[PDB]
Amino acid sequence: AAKNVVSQFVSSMSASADVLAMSKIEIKLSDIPEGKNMAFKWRGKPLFVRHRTKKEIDQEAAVEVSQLRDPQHDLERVKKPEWVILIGVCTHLGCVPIANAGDFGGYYCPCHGSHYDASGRIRKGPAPLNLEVPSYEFTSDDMVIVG
Amino acid sequence: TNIRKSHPLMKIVNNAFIDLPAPSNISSWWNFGSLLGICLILQILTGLFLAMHYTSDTTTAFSSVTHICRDVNYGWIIRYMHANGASMFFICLYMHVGRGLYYGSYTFLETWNIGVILLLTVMATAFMGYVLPWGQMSFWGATVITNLLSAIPYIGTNLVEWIWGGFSVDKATLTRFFAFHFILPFIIMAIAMVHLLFLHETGSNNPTGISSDVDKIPFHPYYTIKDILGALLLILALMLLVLFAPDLLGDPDNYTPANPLNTPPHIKPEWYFLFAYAILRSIPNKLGGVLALAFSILILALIPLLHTSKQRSMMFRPLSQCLFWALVADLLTLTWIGGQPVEHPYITIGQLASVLYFLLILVLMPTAGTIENKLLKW
Amino acid sequence: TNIRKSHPLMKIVNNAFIDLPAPSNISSWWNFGSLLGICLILQILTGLFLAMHYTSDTTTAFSSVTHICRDVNYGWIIRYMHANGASMFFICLYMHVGRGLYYGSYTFLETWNIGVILLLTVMATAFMGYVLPWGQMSFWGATVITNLLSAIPYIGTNLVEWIWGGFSVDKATLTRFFAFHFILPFIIMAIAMVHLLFLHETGSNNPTGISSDVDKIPFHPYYTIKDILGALLLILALMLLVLFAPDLLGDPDNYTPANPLNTPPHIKPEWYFLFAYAILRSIPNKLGGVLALAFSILILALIPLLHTSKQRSMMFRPLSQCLFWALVADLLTLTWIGGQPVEHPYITIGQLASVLYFLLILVLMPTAGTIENKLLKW
Amino acid sequence: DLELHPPSYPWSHRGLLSSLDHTSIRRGFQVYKQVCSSCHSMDYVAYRHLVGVCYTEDEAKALAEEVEVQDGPNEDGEMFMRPGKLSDYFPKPYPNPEAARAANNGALPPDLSYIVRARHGGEDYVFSLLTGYCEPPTGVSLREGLYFNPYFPGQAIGMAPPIYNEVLEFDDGTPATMSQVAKDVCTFLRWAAEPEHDHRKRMGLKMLLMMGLLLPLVYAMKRHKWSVLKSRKLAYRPP
Amino acid sequence: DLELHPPSYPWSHRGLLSSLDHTSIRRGFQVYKQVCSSCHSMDYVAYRHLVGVCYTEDEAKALAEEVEVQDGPNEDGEMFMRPGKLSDYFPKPYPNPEAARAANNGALPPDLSYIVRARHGGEDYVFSLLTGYCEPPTGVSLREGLYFNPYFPGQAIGMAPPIYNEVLEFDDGTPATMSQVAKDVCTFLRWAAEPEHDHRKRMGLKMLLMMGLLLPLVYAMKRHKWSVLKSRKLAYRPP
Ligand code: HEC
Ligand code: HEC
Ligand code: HEM
Ligand code: HEM
Numbered sequence A: 001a002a003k004n005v006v007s008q009f010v011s012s013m014s015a016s017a018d019v020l021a022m023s024k025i026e027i028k029l030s031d032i033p034e035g036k037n038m039a040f041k042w043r044g045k046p047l048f049v050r051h052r053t054k055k056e057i058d059q060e061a062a063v064e065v066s067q068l069r070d071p072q073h074d075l076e077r078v079k080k081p082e083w084v085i086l087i088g089v090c091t092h093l094g095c096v097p098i099a100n101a102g103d104f105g106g107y108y109c110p111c112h113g114s115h116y117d118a119s120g121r122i123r124k125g126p127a128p129l130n131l132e133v134p135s136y137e138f139t140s141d142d143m144v145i146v147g
Numbered sequence B, C: 001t002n003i004r005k006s007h008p009l010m011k012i013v014n015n016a017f018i019d020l021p022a023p024s025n026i027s028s029w030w031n032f033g034s035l036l037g038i039c040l041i042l043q044i045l046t047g048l049f050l051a052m053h054y055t056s057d058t059t060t061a062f063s064s065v066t067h068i069c070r071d072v073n074y075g076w077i078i079r080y081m082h083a084n085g086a087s088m089f090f091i092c093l094y095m096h097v098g099r100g101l102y103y104g105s106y107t108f109l110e111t112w113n114i115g116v117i118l119l120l121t122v123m124a125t126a127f128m129g130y131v132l133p134w135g136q137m138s139f140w141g142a143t144v145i146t147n148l149l150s151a152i153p154y155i156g157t158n159l160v161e162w163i164w165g166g167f168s169v170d171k172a173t174l175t176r177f178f179a180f181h182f183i184l185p186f187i188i189m190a191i192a193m194v195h196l197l198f199l200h201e202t203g204s205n206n207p208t209g210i211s212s213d214v215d216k217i218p219f220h221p222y223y224t225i226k227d228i229l230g231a232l233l234l235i236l237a238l239m240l241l242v243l244f245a246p247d248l249l250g251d252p253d254n255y256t257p258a259n260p261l262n263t264p265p266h267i268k269p270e271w272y273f274l275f276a277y278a279i280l281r282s283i284p285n286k287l288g289g290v291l292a293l294a295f296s297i298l299i300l301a302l303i304p305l306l307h308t309s310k311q312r313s314m315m316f317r318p319l320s321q322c323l324f325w326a327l328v329a330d331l332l333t334l335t336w337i338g339g340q341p342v343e344h345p346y347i348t349i350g351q352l353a354s355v356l357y358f359l360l361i362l363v364l365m366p367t368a369g370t371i372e373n374k375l376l377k378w
Numbered sequence D, E: 001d002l003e004l005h006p007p008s009y010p011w012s013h014r015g016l017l018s019s020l021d022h023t024s025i026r027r028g029f030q031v032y033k034q035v036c037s038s039c040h041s042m043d044y045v046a047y048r049h050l051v052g053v054c055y056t057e058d059e060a061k062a063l064a065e066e067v068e069v070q071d072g073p074n075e076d077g078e079m080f081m082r083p084g085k086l087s088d089y090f091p092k093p094y095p096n097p098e099a100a101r102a103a104n105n106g107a108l109p110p111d112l113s114y115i116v117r118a119r120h121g122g123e124d125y126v127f128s129l130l131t132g133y134c135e136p137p138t139g140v141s142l143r144e145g146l147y148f149n150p151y152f153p154g155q156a157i158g159m160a161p162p163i164y165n166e167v168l169e170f171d172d173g174t175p176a177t178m179s180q181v182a183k184d185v186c187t188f189l190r191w192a193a194e195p196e197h198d199h200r201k202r203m204g205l206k207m208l209l210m211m212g213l214l215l216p217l218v219y220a221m222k223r224h225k226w227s228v229l230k231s232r233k234l235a236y237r238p239p
């Protein structure tokens, strides 16, 4: 009995069904063309999914690993090479980076002076971490669930 | 020597809980104290867990309570435990008081009067609790009952608007009712501890109303095991309501949100106020009705002074026994009448029941005591 | 015989308040207990009055707090009394602990350990209090500090999301933080009473650290009149803040509403956590930093075991005195460093101060005690 | 102002341990969808609520996508209209109560989320109301638009008989008689008002059984400890 | 990312017991009205707030009537626009933050209600910002629209110099220089953020005086009671 009663009361404090409802967001991958970025509303934040070209894949592959402020290779930032999924919150003091711009040709911020590459990694600016890589999995080849 | 009698914290526990000398012969009517404690703790836990999800803002309030029942995990079972737990509290309270009356435990004056205070505090808590869902009966119940205080000359009208924090029961009233409703149970817990502190000055009364010093048994294990059995039966009653009829003791109109225009058909408080609600409606004058409703509870403080019998308990007192059971049946009548619309024959029955309530306490049961005495050459 | 020693309620008051044997010679550092009590009661009243106007819904929360300060009658003076009252509480707490450390009152083990618990409870209360306005520093402070628990292996990440009731500090977190923040002061009041219950087992320590049984004075009038004077000085300090610099001990960024995108420049907790916040940032590894932040408080429980000196008080102990004042100055350094950005030279100073904190408590002050002993042929 | 209270119909969930007929819920939903949802709101039921009750995840996604809902703002600062998803609630017919009154000649159609719980009689009441519409007795008539129902308080309602034979074709092919349509919609409105119903009763059974076990056990423990005292004999032996 | 913090200007309310210059507030309001209120919201200040502070009841009624505000619904179920009254708050320029960003090239103009309290330096900071706009130093330029201000963090702001000589004619005929316009608006924004200011300080004086009285009195009471013990002499008299 006491196991059940306690365990229910513990359950009370964990996320309600309506908070679990906003946990995940489904994105259709055929709705974003090769090269263009598409923004989404996720957990009250922007969420950038970007279809990357054969050029953007190879150009972000052979980048210098050491020179970066936050050393991460590209093939471990993503699950599929042609898709990079990121939270659209600038890591320094919280802005929304604008797509297809900046020095490093990816995301740029007119708040302080940050430049992200096509892989979402900070190259030249005041930001301390790269743009945040969320938890996600591809289900069927056409669809992605983020969360 | 042991570390139950030695340790400053265990000492209080050992004396008031384990080695407490208890009469050998105390009946089921002595379980209600323990059960009141369980009720209070049950309300506090369930209540606290509900307060993690509720909001006192008038727009979101009704929605939050329903959000608890539909989206919050086991929020429904918590919510309905808390609502039926409030009923279980009042069942326990009136049974507990009845015991006191019948067996004359009220002679323990301080214990008794602290009781009266506790009763009044639980009432205040439960009145303000029922407002929190912000349904029709919530809002309209609160409006009518609060606004009775306007019947006081000179100040009454100000007083009402000061409780409200406005010109009707609105935003500031709901928010403060949440704050008072949160704090009061904790004040209850304190006063309940003082209640027992005075009880342990004398120890317990018993069914005979004759002193039991000659035959005391230690509280453990005898009454620890009985209290567990009692607790078990309380949980059964509660869960029978919660899992089989959670709406039985409430009202449907509290499932539509509060509307300051649209008045419900027969506006009424929750069942445990109905007896005193009927007394209010008996008197034609409004201030008279308020003073009668107030005296219908406060008269409990007067009971010890009205005691006439040379015997303490009603066990050995046939006339008093009948008059007592009449007083119970009358209260059951007032509860029924309280739930009815103001019409024939419920007006006249209500008047007649309210007359009989005060007549039984202030005249008949005192007379019966003295008649019983003169029958025993006393 | 009198009805101060007789009456069950007055008896407790007479023994723990009036006829209490107190050492003749206790200094100003003994006032802080009474002042902590006043603080607690002050917070409860002001807090309750604020709760009559506040709402825990994320959208209305910031607005309700400001609505208090602008539209509610004297809501501003209540609000800023409560915020500065929290500061006054922590001033009182650290002074009270310092007294205990310097004069070796911690030898009263149970009293001391209950103290540690009280400290931790007031901390938990004040952390969750600062979240309630739902400003930037509120939201971002809560986010960073809570999320430290994710550093625990296996469970940590679940634990954090379970406190939150979601995937960030949001709707369910604010509502529950209001409920916990309401209940906890009442739990504090209970534990504070147990705190004194153990203190009145031994009576008070004094500045000499020598037993004072040979020269006790009754608490009334001597310390009733001193405590009144103390209370008066506490009210002055509080009201000097409230009426002349109510924003001095807070942060400006908590006057802009909470934004889950827009991060504040240098996110930090309120001043009374800054010392332990600096200790956290000293260790490069995150779980290490959390275990150090936790041990920076819990080490208080270890102090009595670390006691080496054959004398109880530091009064007659020059080396310990210096090391104590070094430990105070170091804590003042950690508070300063805690308030700074993570850069040169504040990283290195912070590391060096955090080393010195644990070094002073675990090595230097114990050694100093034993050196002092061997200087006295002991 | 005489009163005719509803009779107690033998519902498939009438008994203490009887669950809701979920296939009846599935039909009843469609009776809200096809008939009511242009007049009554049902604010507390979302499209996700249907999953694992009357519809699958995939079915409920299709039902959600079928309806309009406002959302915004976008980066431009405008409020657009989008296809619904599981997280969206069942949409209100009108933007507000005042608009609703205008569309129904003064009378406000109540939200149906809790209507079973908010009216005395519950599903027995609603079923009687929906099927009970009849021709008025002699000596009687209300305002042009207020119909005669013997189960409504004051004997006159402001709702046009909403159910009749074949007002909808059901997805599982059940013959849609007036009484079948009412039965189903009531069963849905019961679940609307009280989603917990089935879990509640599962817990009830498990409570009754555990209490069946623990009560006589604890009672036996009681009699065991007390047996020292129940047995005892006293003797008074003065000198 | 170097930093230039503002100097401490001698405000008429700088001192412990110094009240706000209410005529300066009256001017400063108009500097919000004429200049800011098309860009910044000030949600927590209503037209009633002005009464007994900088304007009369009748003046504040006129200022309220001057502006548009949405209200509804009416019995038809529509949302209309009406002339403002005292109960209405100062209206937001845009319907939402996302609309505001679009109008100001990405940057969101902060609400001004608490801006004195929400920025380090307060009125000293804002005054320096408003008057401190200058030509950039050599080696420097930002994006086309982001101006140079030495007092803003990161040295580059997203606000066009808003104040200059004679940007407004004041109601009392004060010569509207850039520094006079900034001084006044700061004094208003101080009152915006902290309406209690004048009452707070009135209470401060009365507290200081009562404490001036009670502290030495209570201290005298202390020494009085304790004087039995302070005076006492001990003597050890073994046999
Ligand atoms: C075109 C209008 C319209 C349609 C179609 C309609 N309703 Fe209603 N309904 C109303 C109005 C108007 C009222 C308010 C009546 C009154 O107050 O007199 C109402 C009232 C109700 C009530 C409240 C009765 C009470 O006790 O007060 C219930 C229950 C109800 N409707 C259920 C339904 C169900 C079930 C359906 C279809 C399966 C339905 N309605 C279809 C307009 C409609
Ligand atoms: C046409 C546009 C416009 C006008 C006119 C304008 N502002 Fe602003 N203001 C902005 C924008 C955009 C920002 C955000 C700047 C940024 O983040 O870089 C801003 C920011 C501010 C800030 C915040 C500075 C900080 O520390 O972050 C203050 C204070 C301010 N304005 C006050 C005023 C006052 C006072 C006036 C007039 C008396 C005024 N503004 C007129 C657009 C305007
Ligand atoms: C929250 C409400 C209350 C709690 C928690 C409480 C608690 C208790 C407890 C635990 C006991 C001892 C066990 C028992 O005999 O039942 C007791 C006894 C008593 N209580 Fe209460 N009580 C409450 C309310 C009241 C009220 C409302 C009254 C009277 C108006 C009252 C009067 C008494 C008396 C007279 C006794 C002594 C009984 C005897 O020895 O025979 N109590 N109470
Ligand atoms: C003597 C103790 C208490 C009594 C008698 C009591 C009574 C009630 C009642 C009758 C309701 C209305 C229930 C309903 O119709 O839904 C209610 C609601 C509520 N109570 Fe209590 N209560 C008590 C203690 C507490 C405590 C300690 C808390 C919080 C710490 C609390 C929090 C709530 C909340 C949040 C609600 C609204 C949710 C709901 O409606 O169930 N209560 N209370």
Ligand code: HEM
Binding pocket: C029, C030, C031, C032, C033, C034, C036, C037, C040, C093, C096, C097, C100, C103, C105, C106, C108, C111, C112, C114, C115, C116, C118, C119, C122, C188, C192, C195, C196, C199, C203, C204, C205, C206, C300
């Ligand atoms: C809400 C928090 C607290 C309250 C209300 C409180 C209350 C009191 C009071 C009234 C006294 C007696 C007067 C005095 O000597 O100051 C006292 C003594 C004491 N407290 Fe606390 N206290 C609190 C927190 C703490 C903490 C955090 C500690 C230690 C970590 C502590 C340890 C002690 C000790 C050791 C004494 C004995 C002092 C002596 O006899 O010299 N207390 N407390």
Ligand code: HEM
Binding pocket: C040, C043, C044, C045, C046, C047, C048, C050, C051, C054, C065, C079, C080, C082, C083, C086, C089, C122, C125, C126, C129, C130, C131, C132, C133, C181, C182, C185, C186, C188
């Ligand atoms: C140890 C006792 C307490 C402490 C240390 C404490 C601390 C705090 C702090 C630091 C804040 C934030 C103040 C601010 O920045 O505005 C706060 C807010 C608040 N507290 Fe408490 N509190 C205590 C007791 C209480 C109690 C008992 C209640 C209610 C019964 C309460 C109700 C509130 C409310 C409603 C707020 C939000 C209003 C505001 O921000 O001032 N507090 N508390």
Ligand SMILES: CC1=NC2=C(CCCC2)C(=O)C1c1ccc(Oc2ccc(OC(F)(F)F)cc2)cc1
Binding pocket: B016, B017, B020, B021, B022, B023, B030, B031, B033, B034, B036, B037, B038, B040, B041, B189, B192, B193, B196, B203, B204, B223, B227
């Ligand atoms: C303390 C008690 N004294 C007595 C009797 C009858 C016989 C003699 C006196 C009791 O049954 C008794 C008692 C009271 C309460 C019990 O459970 C609790 C329930 C709640 C509780 O908390 C609090 F403080 F009451 F709020 C504390 C204990 C268990 C036993």
Ligand SMILES: CC1=NC2=C(CCCC2)C(=O)C1c1ccc(Oc2ccc(OC(F)(F)F)cc2)cc1
Binding pocket: C016, C017, C020, C021, C022, C023, C030, C031, C033, C034, C036, C037, C038, C040, C041, C189, C192, C193, C196, C203, C204, C223, C227
């Ligand atoms: C109870 C007390 N005992 C002692 C000393 C010093 C000397 C000896 C021991 C005290 O100053 C002392 C005391 C403690 C608190 C005082 O005021 C209160 C403040 C708060 C309060 O409530 C509660 F319970 F603490 F929460 C109760 C009393 C007044 C006096």
Ligand code: FES
Binding pocket: A090, A092, A093, A094, A095, A109, A111, A112, A113, A114, A125, A126, A127
């Ligand atoms: S705020 Fe965009 S990088 Fe500093």
